[PDB]
Design a binder for this molecule. Sequence first.
Ligand code: NDP
Ligand code: NDP
Lengths: 325, 325
Amino acid sequence: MAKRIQFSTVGGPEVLEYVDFEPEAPGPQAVVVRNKAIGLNFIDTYYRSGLYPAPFLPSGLGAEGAGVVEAVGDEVTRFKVGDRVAYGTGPLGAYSEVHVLPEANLVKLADSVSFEQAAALMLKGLTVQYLLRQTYQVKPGEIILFHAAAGGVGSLACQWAKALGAKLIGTVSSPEKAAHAKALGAWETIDYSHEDVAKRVLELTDGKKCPVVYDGVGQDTWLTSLDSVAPRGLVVSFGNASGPVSGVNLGILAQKDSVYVTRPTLGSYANNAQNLQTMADELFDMLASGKLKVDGIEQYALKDAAKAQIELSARRTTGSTILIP
Amino acid sequence: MAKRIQFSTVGGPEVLEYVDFEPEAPGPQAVVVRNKAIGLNFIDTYYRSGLYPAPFLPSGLGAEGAGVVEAVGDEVTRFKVGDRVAYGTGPLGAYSEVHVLPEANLVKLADSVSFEQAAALMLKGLTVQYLLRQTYQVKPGEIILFHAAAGGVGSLACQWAKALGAKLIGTVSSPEKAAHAKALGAWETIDYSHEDVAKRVLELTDGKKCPVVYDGVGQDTWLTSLDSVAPRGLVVSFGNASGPVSGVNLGILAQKDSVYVTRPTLGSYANNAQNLQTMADELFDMLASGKLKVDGIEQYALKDAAKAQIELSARRTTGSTILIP
Ligand SMILES: NC(=O)C1=CN([C@@H]2O[C@H](COP(=O)(O)OP(=O)(O)OC[C@H]3O[C@@H](n4cnc5c(N)ncnc54)[C@H](OP(=O)(O)O)[C@@H]3O)[C@@H](O)[C@H]2O)C=CC1
Ligand SMILES: NC(=O)C1=CN([C@@H]2O[C@H](COP(=O)(O)OP(=O)(O)OC[C@H]3O[C@@H](n4cnc5c(N)ncnc54)[C@H](OP(=O)(O)O)[C@@H]3O)[C@@H](O)[C@H]2O)C=CC1
């Protein structure tokens, strides 16, 4: 028996229950991980709310974590008991003392990386990697727009953008979050709790606007992003914090001067035990070289996962926050 | 006084009237063209139907044509009376004996190109140019999907794709249109009057699907295009023959494996008297080199523009068709 956070029905935070459950016996290519640190991600709230249906109820939650390998399937050779690993993709269940998942979703941690750093970087870091390196290969000097610049993904994006020589214009909801973003490497900040983002962008870019706009909040900033992208530019809708963007008429893309739009998912970029490896190597290489940093991690006891999600959804957090089993 | 085709109200073909009107005096940078050949384009039916509002009623129609310069604005130096020109962008009014437009929308014709070739190539040719060279730089060997392969744009696309060494899979509504497309350079054809396009595409591409899908029919093929694009591939929605594609939830882009979508417009790519020049030079260079050809042009008297539009909308045409003033 082991403890985990699960829900028997979709809904608000009250739906989460900290209870005993019986971990499954690893498949031939599965790995049993004894979690030491668990990630907190906005998508966790969507599975719990039902925005994204689970395969069955009661359901586990979470897809990011780091810990020690406890058991290995008979066909697994990459990992052995005792190995220190991390993951940011795979089946639900990270919110547990013991998580079982395909070896394809795991990446061995270098002795130099702690479990807290991994649980705070993995998923969000892999996302920034594909957003800035694959979805749209940001080049030095480019002026890009990135919403929620002080959030989990946003904070890493500020740092990565700076590392690339790009000039990231990060939108935030308060002068406090603005200072946070700026300190992490944001070129310019815009407080969209009252400022006109599109206007500010037009002036900051000398009327040329941004070749690419990264939007993880969705609904509330869709028009803003459409008005901030340069002609034939790209609007990357990778999040739905404020809600999903729907009911769009492709005709608006033409109206905004023939722009492009994509709705990427980590699963599509890290769709191999291996495209994951290459991506993870770059992420951890950034950390090891000192271009990315975490130090400054809020910690909640796995049993208090509900409290942690409430703060996240309430927009009362900055950077990464982890759960300790 | 001169004759033109105009409409005092939006609606069906019956709305078109062949009447006398008084051409305006060219502005300082405007050019008066004595049309010898006028293009027929699907968008013409949309302005007439009201899908795209005119600035005022009664309104002229058409944006493609070729003829002799009759008058020049005082500030115009690129053109002089007698010059043989062509245009595929600009204000409404091509459906006339005399059309007045900014010099920025004109391109001098080489003595070797007749007015019929220009009126049949200009707009559609410039579109294929930006679709295959700018929207998505098709490379030799790539397998691409292109709907309505026997249409005006489609027919040129079959030829251009072949010239590029690409393998175009063209969808058509009949074995007759299929033969037409094939003869023009289409690699493979699919009769979507009954065949499963997505299925055929999956088998023709060995399960890899198409890096890019060009869709000028819209509504009726949106899902088909989404199911025919490769992961992280691009779906180019440049037309609405079957109707516009609306009410889409960006979430479907993720569902189809993180794809991209754009809704380009000729105006956005040929947005300069000059980006037009470079594009036109390539188009006419293809014609001059024998890679693109027209010969096989249906002709309607400008006064019978309604009959011409009825056939176009009825899907009873192949290649280009022009109106003679
Ligand atoms: N596509 C993919 O592969 C992935 C997508 N994501 C998505 O990326 C985004 C960022 O996730 P993560 O780093 O975990 O989260 P964050 O830590 O960034 O938290 C969300 C932040 O978004 C902003 N926000 C704007 N409007 C709202 C709103 N109405 N309610 C709540 N928050 C709002 C807030 O910042 P402020 O107060 O400054 O506005 C808030 O702090 C999410 O939308 C997430 O679902 C995450 C991982 C992968
Ligand atoms: N974005 C841009 O810059 C431009 C866009 N366009 C658009 O490109 C497309 C092609 O235009 P053009 O070459 O003039 O036209 P076409 O000559 O290709 O005529 C339209 C063709 O589309 C297909 N089609 C499919 N469904 C329908 C339907 N329900 N009703 C009528 N036709 C249908 C038909 O071929 P089949 O019978 O084989 O299915 C038909 O022949 C149009 O949608 C047009 O508006 C044109 C120029 C520029």
